[PDB]
Ligand binder design. Structure first.
Ligand SMILES: CC(C)CCC[C@@H](C)[C@H]1CC[C@H]2[C@@H]3CC=C4C[C@@H](OC(=O)CCC(=O)O)CC[C@]4(C)[C@H]3CC[C@]12C
Ligand SMILES: CC(C)CCC[C@@H](C)[C@H]1CC[C@H]2[C@@H]3CC=C4C[C@@H](OC(=O)CCC(=O)O)CC[C@]4(C)[C@H]3CC[C@]12C
Ligand SMILES: Nc1ncnc2c1ncn2[C@@H]1O[C@H](COP(=O)(O)OP(=O)(O)O)[C@@H](O)[C@H]1O
Ligand SMILES: Nc1ncnc2c1ncn2[C@@H]1O[C@H](COP(=O)(O)OP(=O)(O)O)[C@@H](O)[C@H]1O
Ligand SMILES: [Mg+2]
Ligand SMILES: [Mg+2]
Lengths: 552, 573
C-alpha cells in the first residue's frame, strides 16, 4: 500500500528520471577533470579558454539535472492530488462528519508538497553525494549498503513511525482549536473571551511541542547511532594485498563525509514518508455507497412513486441511538405529501435516505417498485430527485453558472426559462452585470429570500420527477417568505413533492399529512381526517388558530 | 520587519544555540583523531587500544546526538513562541480583515507556514554547522596569514550573491506568484469538499473535479517557473565558485613569482578551495528550502505585525452605580469598508431609554443587523457618534462593553466543541458552577439539560450530540445572562424556529428582557406590539417612530406592514 501505490505514480516519470541520472553522472565527471587540468596550469590562453568551456558545460549539466528533478517531482504531485481529490469526493457522508474539511484540504495540498519537496531533496543531495563517491570496490559498496539496511534492521525494534503518528495526531488537534477560534471569531468577540481561546490554544500549543520534541529526540538518536555504526563498520572491515587495505581506510573516510550529508536529511526522510503515507491512506479508501453502480429508468417509464416499507434507521456515528423506527410511508405520483413533526423526529433524516446519502438499517426505500440500492445514485440525485434545504448553498462563480449546476448539458436559454419559473429572472436582470455577477465571499452578498429563489431554479433545470422541500422558508422575512412560497407551489405542480414545512398553513392543502414522534408515523391522513381524529394535528392547529385570531 | 522581529524570537534561545556550536566543533574534532588512531592500530596491546577506540566512537556519537537534540529543541520552542504571538495578533484584528481573508488560509499560515520555516531553519543550521566545521578545521590547518584572507573572501562571495538575489525582483516575485496560485487551488478544494452534500445533491462531481483540475495544472505551471528559477541560481553559483578559483590562482600566482608568497601556499590553497567547493555544494542543494522557508517565514511575520483600527482593551469603564443603560445614536452614518461607495446607514438618529424595550422593524437589507454590530463596536461610524450613557463608545473599553455591558443574541446560535456547562460558562470566565445553573433556569434550559444522560457534562457540536434549533437558542440566552448585561440585543432570535419551539424561546427571552435596555430586531410583528416604541427603517434612515397605537393612527409604513400581517393571519384561520 505504501510502496505498491508509490510505484504507480513514479513509473511514467521514470524515463525522464533516468536522463537526470546521466546528467548528474556527467556533471561530476567534468568535476574530476577540473583539479586535474587546474594542476597542469599563448600556452595559458589556450588552456584558460578550454577551462571556461568546461565550467559552462558543468553548469548546464547541473541546471538540467535539477530542472528535470523539479519537473518529475511537480508532475508526480499533480497526479497524486488529482487521484486523492477524486477519491475524497467519492467517499460517503459518514466520513465527512468524522473528518474536518480543513484537515482534508491540508492532506491534499500540504502533505503532498511535504512529500514532493522531501523526494526532491533526497535525490538532489543523494545523487550529487553518490557521484562524489577491483577488491577494494566490493568492500566499499558493502559499507554503503549497510546503513541503508541496518537503519531498517533496527527500525524493527522501536518504531519512529509511532512517534510521528502521535505527533500528527496533536498537530491536527491544535489545528482544530485555531479553526474553531478564528472561524467563529465574531462569537468570541461578542462574549469577549479572547484570553480564554488564547489559553485553550496555548495549552494545545505546548503539547504540540512536547510530542514534536519526543520525535525530534528520536530522529537525533538514529543520526547519532548511525555515526557510531559507520565508524564500527570501518573497524569491522579492518579486522575482516596490503596496499588495498591501506587505500580502503582513506576511501572509507571519503564515504563517511558523503553519508553524513544524507544523515542530516534523515529528519526530512521521516517527515516526507509520514506525509506521503497519509496521502495514500485516504486515496485507497472505498465508500459503502458507490456513485455509478446501478440501473437507470427512462422518463417514459419513471412515474414517481416513492415507497418506504418498514424502514428502520440509526446513524453510523450513533449505532445505539435509533432515529427512524419502523417508518412506513408511500408517496403517490404527482401528489404532494406533507411531513409534520417535532424537531429531532427524523424529518430531515427521511429526506437524506431518499437522496440515498445513507441506506436503511432495516426495510427498503423504493422508487416505482425499484429499490434505491439497485438504482444509479448519480442518476437519482442528478435527474430524478430535486432537493431544497432550509439554508441554500451558493458557490463562488457567476449567477448563470450557479443555477447551471442543476444540469451540466444545459443551454443559456434553459437557465433563463428555469429562472422565470422560480421568480428569479425579475431581480437578476435588475443587477448591473446581471447573470454575469459573481456571488459568495468575493461576490455581492444576497438576502435570504433572493438566495433560496436561485436554489429553486437550480433544481428545476434537471426536470425532477420527485421534489424534496425541507423547511425552504425557515429563516426568511415575512415579505420574502410569501414570495419564495408562491414560486415553490408553481414548481410543485405535476410532481411528487415531499413538503417538510414548519408553517402548518401551507401543508393544509396537501394530498395527506404525516405527523411524526420518536421516529414513527404517529398520525396520517388528509387535513379534514386529522381534525375529525382529534389528534396531535388537531391540538397543533388549535394553538395555531388562537395565534392567528389574535394577529387579526 | 523580516529580520527585526526574527531576532526577537532567536535572542532567548541564542544561549542554548551556542552550546550546540561547541558540541558540533567537538564531534568533528574526534572525527580527525579517528583515522589518526586507526592508522596506529594497523593481544593485550591490541585489546587496550581497541577498547580505547570504542570509547572515542561513543563520545563522537554522543556529541552528534546532543548537538542535533539542542537544535531540535531551539527550533521547536521558537515555533511555539511564533504561533502564540501570531494567534494573539490574529484574534485582535478587526472584523473587516476576517471578511477579506478566509479562515482556512489563516489556519495554514499559523500551522503550515511556521513549520515550513522551522524545519527549513533546522536544515540550514544542521547541514551548515556540520559543513562549516569541515571547512574551519581545514582552514586553520592548511592556510597561513595571507591564504586565510583569500579563503574567507571566496566563502563570502556566493553569500553576497545569495542574499542579494533572494531580495531581488526575480526569485521573490516567482515565490509570491506561486503562493498566490497555491491558495487559489486550496480555495477550490475547500468550497467543493466543504459543500460536498450540495455537490452530491445535484450530482456535479466531475464539474468540481474539472474546476480543481484546471487550478491544479496552473499550480504546477507557477511552481515549475520557480523550480526553473531556483535551478538557474544553483547552476550559476557553481560557475561563480569555479571562476573564483581561477581568479585567485592568477592573483596569488603573480605574488608567488615575486617572493611575496611561497609556491607551497598557492599549491595548498588549490587543495583547500576544492574542499570548500564540496562543502558549499551541500548548501547549494538546500537553496530550494531556503527560498521556501524565507517565503513562508515572511508570511508569518506579515500578519503578526498588523495593527487593527479598533483595539480590545483601550478605553474606560463605567461603574455599576453610574451605568444606567441609555444608548444614543446621533446622526450616525455608516458604509462598510468593503463597499466604501454603497451607503448602508444614512443619518441614523435613535435613542434607547434605560430599562425600556425598543423594537426595530424594517425591510431586509435596510441595515438592521448593521445597527446591532455598531453597538457591539465591531465597526465605528463614518459620521456621527454612538453613545452609552453620554459616553462615546470610542473612549470606552471594548472588552468591558462586549464582555459585561451588552448581551448579544443572533438569529443563528454558535456552540463550541466542549461540554454544555463550559459552553454556557463562555459568558463570565470567573463564573462558579452554581452561577451557570441559576442562569440556565432563567432561560428554561435547566429543564431539558438535566433530562440528558450525562447532563451538563455532555459534549455538543460535531463530535457531541446534535441539538434542535429551539434547544440551541435557549442555551445562547443563558450564556449572555451570566455576565449580567445592562443592554440586550435580540437580532431575529426566533427566526428558523418551529411553531412550538418559537413559543418556548420567546417565553424565556421576554422574562430575560425584564429590567434591561433591549433592542429587539424581530421579524414577527406580533412580539414587538408590546414595546416602549417601534422604529421603522427605510434606505438606512428612521422613516417612522412611535408606540404601537401611534404608528397605526399615523397610517404609514407600519400600517401597510400590519395590513399584510392581517391578511396572512386570516389565511391561517
Ligand atoms: C528510500 C529511503 C527510505 C532511503 C533512500 C536513501 C536512504 C539513506 C541513505 C543513506 C543514509 C546515511 C546513513 O548514515 C550514515 O551512514 C552516516 C554515518 C555518519 O554520520 O558518519 C543513515 C541512513 C540514510 C539517511 C538512509 C536512510 C533511508 C533512505 C533515505
Ligand atoms: C537562519 C539564518 C542564520 C540564515 C539567514 C541567511 C541566509 C539567507 C543565508 C545563510 C547561509 C547562506 C548560504 C550559504 C552558502 C551557499 C552556497 C552557494 O553555492 C556555492 O557556493 C556552491 C558552488 C558550487 O556548486 O560549487 C549558494 C548560496 C548559499 C546556498 C547561501 C544562500 C543564503 C544563505 C542560506
Ligand atoms: N449527522 C448526524 N449525526 C448524528 N445524528 C444526527 C445527524 N443528523 C441528525 N441526527 C439525529 O437524528 C435525529 C433527527 O434528525 P433530523 O431529521 O435532522 O431532525 P428534524 O426532525 O428536526 O428534521 C436527531 O436526534 C438528531 O440528533
Ligand atoms: N459583511 C458585510 N459586507 C458587506 N456588506 C454587508 C455586510 N453585512 C451587511 N452588508 C450589507 O448591508 C446592508 C444591510 O445589512 P443587514 O443589516 O445585515 O441587513 P438586515 O436589515 O436584513 O438585517 C445590505 O445591503 C447588506 O448587503
Ligand atoms: Mg431538520
Ligand atoms: Mg438581519
Amino acid at each position: 500500500f505504501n510502496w505498491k501505490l508509490f510505484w504507480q505514480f513514479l513509473h511514467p516519470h521514470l524515463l525522464v528520471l533516468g536522463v537526470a541520472v546521466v546528467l548528474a553522472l556527467g556533471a561530476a565527471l567534468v568535476n574530476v577533470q577540473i583539479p586535474l587540468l587546474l594542476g597542469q596550469l599563448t600556452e595559458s590562453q589556450n588552456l584558460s579558454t578550454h577551462l571556461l568551456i568546461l565550467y559552462g558545460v558543468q553548469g548546464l549539466l547541473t541546471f538540467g539535472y535539477l530542472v528535470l528533478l523539479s519537473h518529475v517531482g511537480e508532475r508526480m504531485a499533480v497526479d497524486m492530488r488529482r487521484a486523492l481529490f477524486s477519491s475524497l469526493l467519492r467517499q460517503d457522508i459518514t466520513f465527512f462528519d468524522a473528518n474536518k474539511t480543513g484537515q482534508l484540504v491540508s492532506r491534499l495540498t500540504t502533505d503532498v508538497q511535504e512529500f514532493k519537496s522531501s523526494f526532491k531533496l533526497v535525490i538532489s543531495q543523494g545523487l550529487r553525494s553518490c557521484t562524489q563517491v577491483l577488491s577494494t570496490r566490493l568492500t566499499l559498496l558493502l559499507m554503503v549498503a549497510t546503513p541503508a539496511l541496518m537503519g531498517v534492521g533496527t527500525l524493527m525494534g522501536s518504531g519512529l513511525r509511532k512517534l510521528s503518528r502521535q505527533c500528527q495526531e496533536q498537530i491536527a488537534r491544535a489545528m482544530g482549536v485555531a479553526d474553531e477560534a478564528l472561524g467563529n471569531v465574531r462569537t468570541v468577540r461578542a462574549f469577549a473571551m479572547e484570553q480564554r481561546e488564547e489559553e485553550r490554544y496555548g495549552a494545545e500549543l505546548e503539547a504540540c511541542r512536547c510530542r514534536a520534541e519526543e520525535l525530534g529526540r528520536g530522529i537525533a538518536l538514529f543520526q547519532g547511532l548511525s555515526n557510531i555504526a559507520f565508524n564500527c563498520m570501518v573497524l569491522g572491515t579492518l579486522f575482516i594485498t596490503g596496499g588495498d587495505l591501506m587505500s580502503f581506510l582513506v576511501a572509507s573516510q571519503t564515504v563517511q563525509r558523503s553519508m553524513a550529508n544524507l544523515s542530516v536529511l534523515f529528519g526530512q526522510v521521516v517527515r516526507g514518508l509520514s506525509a506521503g503515507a497519509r496521502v495514500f491512506e485516504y486515496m485507497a479508501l472505498n465508500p459503502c455507497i458507490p456513485l455509478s453502480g446501478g440501473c437507470c429508468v427512462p422518463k417514459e417509464q419513471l412515474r414517481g412513486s416513492v415507497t418506504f416499507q418498514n424502514v428502520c434507521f440509526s446513524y453510523p456515528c450513533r449505532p445505539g441511538f435509533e432515529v427512524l423506527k419502523d417508518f412506513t410511508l408511500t408517496l403517490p405520483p404527482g401528489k404532494i405529501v406533507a411531513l409534520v413533526g417535532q424537531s429531532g423526529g427524523g424529518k430531515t433524516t427521511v429526506a437524506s435516505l431518499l437522496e440515498r446519502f445513507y441506506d436503511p438499517t432495516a426495510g427498503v426505500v423504493m422508487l416505482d417498485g425499484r429499490d434505491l440500492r439497485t438504482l444509479d445514485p448519480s442518476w437519482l440525485r442528478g435527474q430524478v430527485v430535486g432537493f431544497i434545504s432550509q439554508e441554500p448553498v451558493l458557490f463562488g462563480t457567476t449567477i448563470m453558472e450557479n443555477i447551471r449546476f442543476g444540469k451540466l448539458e444545459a443551454s443559456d436559454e434553459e437557465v433563463y426559462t428555469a429562472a422565470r419559473e422560480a421568480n428569479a429572472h425579475e431581480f437578476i436582470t435588475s443587477f448591473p452585470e446581471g447573470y454575469n455577477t459573481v456571488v459568495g465571499e468575493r461576490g455581492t452578498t444576497l438576502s435570504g429570500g433572493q438566495k433560496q429563489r436561485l436554489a429553486i431554479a437550480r433544481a428545476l433545470i434537471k426536470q425532477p420527477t420527485v421534489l424534496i422541500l425541507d423547511e425552504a422558508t425557515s429563516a426568511l422575512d415575512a415579505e420574502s417568505e410569501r414570495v419564495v412560497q408562491e414560486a415553490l407551489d408553481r414548481a410543485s405542480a405535476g410532481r411528487t413533492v415531499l413538503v417538510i414545512a414548519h408553517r402548518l398553513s401551507t401543508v393544509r392543502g396537501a394530498h395527506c399529512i404525516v405527523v411524526m414522534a420518536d421516529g414513527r408515523v404517529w398520525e396520517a391522513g388528509t387535513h379534514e381526517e386529522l381534525l375529525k381524529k382529534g389528534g396531535l394535528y388537531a391540538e397543533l392547529i388549535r394553538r395555531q388558530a388562537l395565534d392567528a385570531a389574535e394577529n387579526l
